[PDB]
Structure 1
Amino acid sequence: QKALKNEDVAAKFEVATKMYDAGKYNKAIRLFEQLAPTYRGKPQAEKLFYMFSQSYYKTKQYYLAGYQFESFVSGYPRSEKVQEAAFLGAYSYSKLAPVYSLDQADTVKALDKLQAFIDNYPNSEYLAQANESVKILNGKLEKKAYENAKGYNTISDYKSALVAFDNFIADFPGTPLKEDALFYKYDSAYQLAINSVPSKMEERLHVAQTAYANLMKYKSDTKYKEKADQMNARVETDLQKFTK
């Protein structure tokens, strides 16, 4: 309070150091924000901006911490702790990743930073956590696409579900959700064939058989084998009516 109003940057900086020492990150942040522009560039600016970004990080203000850490590496190039700021900068932006349902604008941004951090600083100490975060972030993108495709099947619209699932099993290869996508693709074609115009019922029946084979070929001991076998029985039975 007294240091904030007072123009003596030295006293305010010393006071801020004490605040950050005892975990008073909330109080020190207020004083540090004002002294950040005037104390920029100065030789002691390495310690100021370092704790400044650390306080934001410890206060869960990931957005502010990410930007502060990013500029810390940018401004001060060869700081003794540049690597730590680089990792925490990307790791902070990743914490702000929304759920798969919401817009994944921050998820892409976090991936770019995390990916670049690995390439720019190989054989780092934080490489393990960086890879784990990347895998978690990539899961959100896959889950979003899978849920969107499965959303059609929930509201029927089986014609759109086939197209959506076809793209998903192609845009995201080698994913743990492939088994589920394969089954729902078969269900979408099964429901579309059992209830369709008699003119093109044969075409849809064939697609159902193809989807069933793909599901079984992927994992013979699929969890949906009981239901899948029952569905194929109807397709084969109905196919006999078109055995010209």
Structure 2
Amino acid sequence: RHSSPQEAFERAMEFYNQGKYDRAIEYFKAVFTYGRTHEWAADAQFYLARAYYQNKEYLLAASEYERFIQIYQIDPRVPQAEYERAMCYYKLSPPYELDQTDTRKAIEAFQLFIDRYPNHELVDDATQKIRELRAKLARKQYEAARLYERRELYEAAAVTYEAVFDAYPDTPWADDALVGAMRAYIAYAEQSVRARQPERYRRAVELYERLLQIFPDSPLLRTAEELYTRARQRLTELEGDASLAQGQRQN
């Protein structure tokens, strides 16, 4: 097998270069049987992380990237390592219908990277990954809201649409979700006892302003105007109704 860190390293690289990642990995690990002080330890650790990655062992990759960063803090590759570690979670991030634990892990990892090295070459890439991961999360919530609305659970729909624009305001689903929330609040109001309607209509009225303030160029502004008009006119009739008293909780 091997007699020195160099033989083990170069054998690992031989396997690595021809895509024999399982074998490479075994040889990178062998390097460390001679300790980590020799001149090959940094490279061995860095390419071990990459070999796991190329072998699609992302959790193992992530751990080894982390170890590289822990051990060799002024190695010029430390920023790359932090980025590629975030990529492990990115690869693990599954389709939006499934549990999004690893999606949230990836986002945090990328965000830390961006905070730590705000001008790094890889920042644009990391930002694009964040946008893509955030869109998954937004879509999951948007589709959930649609299902509630379809089931005529309108309060549930409304707050689930709000999750999209409150938690993920930069995703492409955010303006769609504001409109969806207005529609749901209108429908929630309609199913409500008269005295509890104003505050529900008020929510829809307030969401339109936010749409206008945050997405001034949204194509949905004109679409949503009709919704806003319905909410506003109904709220006016209610507010102008001299015979509708309103308990304190309804103002």
- Give TM-score, length-normalised by structure 2: 0.71
Partner of residue 134, structure 2: 138
Partner of residue 201, structure 1: 194
The size of the alignment, in residue pairs, is: 235
Structure 2 matches for 1:77-226, cutoff 5 A? Answer: 77-166=73-162, 168-173=164-169, 176-196=172-192, 200-201=193-194, 203-204=196-197, 207-208=200-201, 211=204, 214-215=207-208, 218=212, 223=220
Q: CA deviation at 1:168?
A: 4.8
Structure 2 matches for 1:25-64, cutoff 5 A? Answer: 25-33=21-29, 35=30, 37-41=32-36, 42-64=38-60
Q: Secondary structure at the match of 1:103?
A: coil
Q: CA deviation at 1:207?
A: 3.4
Separation (CA, whole Å) in 1 of partners of 2:227 and 2:169: 28
Instruction: Give the aligned residue type for 1:177.
Output: W
Tell which deviates more after alignment, 37-46 or 9-18.
9-18
Segments of 5+ residues of structure 2 without an aligned counterpart are 243-251
Tell which deviates more after alignment, 23-32 or 128-137.
23-32
Q: Secondary structure at the match of 1:18?
A: helix
Tell which deviates more after alignment, 119-128 or 170-179.
170-179
Q: Deviations over 1:153-186 (max 9, x none)?
A: 1221113333444555444446543432233223
Segments of 5+ residues of structure 1 without an aligned counterpart are none
Does the 8 Å CA contact 2:165/2:174 hold for their aligned counterparts? yes
C-alpha spacing 1:153/1:8, structure 2 compared with 1 (3 Å): same
C-alpha spacing 1:154/1:58, structure 2 compared with 1 (3 Å): same
Instruction: Give the aligned residue type for 2:157.
Output: A
Partner of residue 68, structure 2: 72
Q: Secondary structure at the match of 1:189?
A: helix
Q: Deviations over 1:54-100 (max 9, x none)?
A: 22222233222222122112122333433322221222222222333
Tell which deviates more after alignment, 202-211 or 132-141.
202-211
Does the 8 Å CA contact 1:190/1:231 hold for their aligned counterparts? no
Which structure has the bigger radius of gyration? 1
Partner of residue 19, structure 2: 23
Aligned CA-pair RMSD = 3.8
- Give TM-score, length-normalised by structure 1: 0.73
Tell which deviates more after alignment, 223-232 or 148-157.
223-232
Tell which deviates more after alignment, 204-213 or 61-70.
204-213
Does the 8 Å CA contact 2:204/2:231 hold for their aligned counterparts? no
Q: Secondary structure at the match of 2:96?
A: coil
- Equivalent pairs: percent with the same residue? 28
Instruction: Give the aligned residue type for 2:82.
Output: A
Q: Secondary structure at the match of 1:87?
A: helix
Q: Deviations over 1:171-209 (max 9, x none)?
A: 44465434322332232233334444xxx2354267347
Separation (CA, whole Å) in 1 of partners of 2:11 and 2:181: 64
Separation (CA, whole Å) in 2 of partners of 1:121 and 1:230: 45
Does the 8 Å CA contact 2:146/2:157 hold for their aligned counterparts? yes
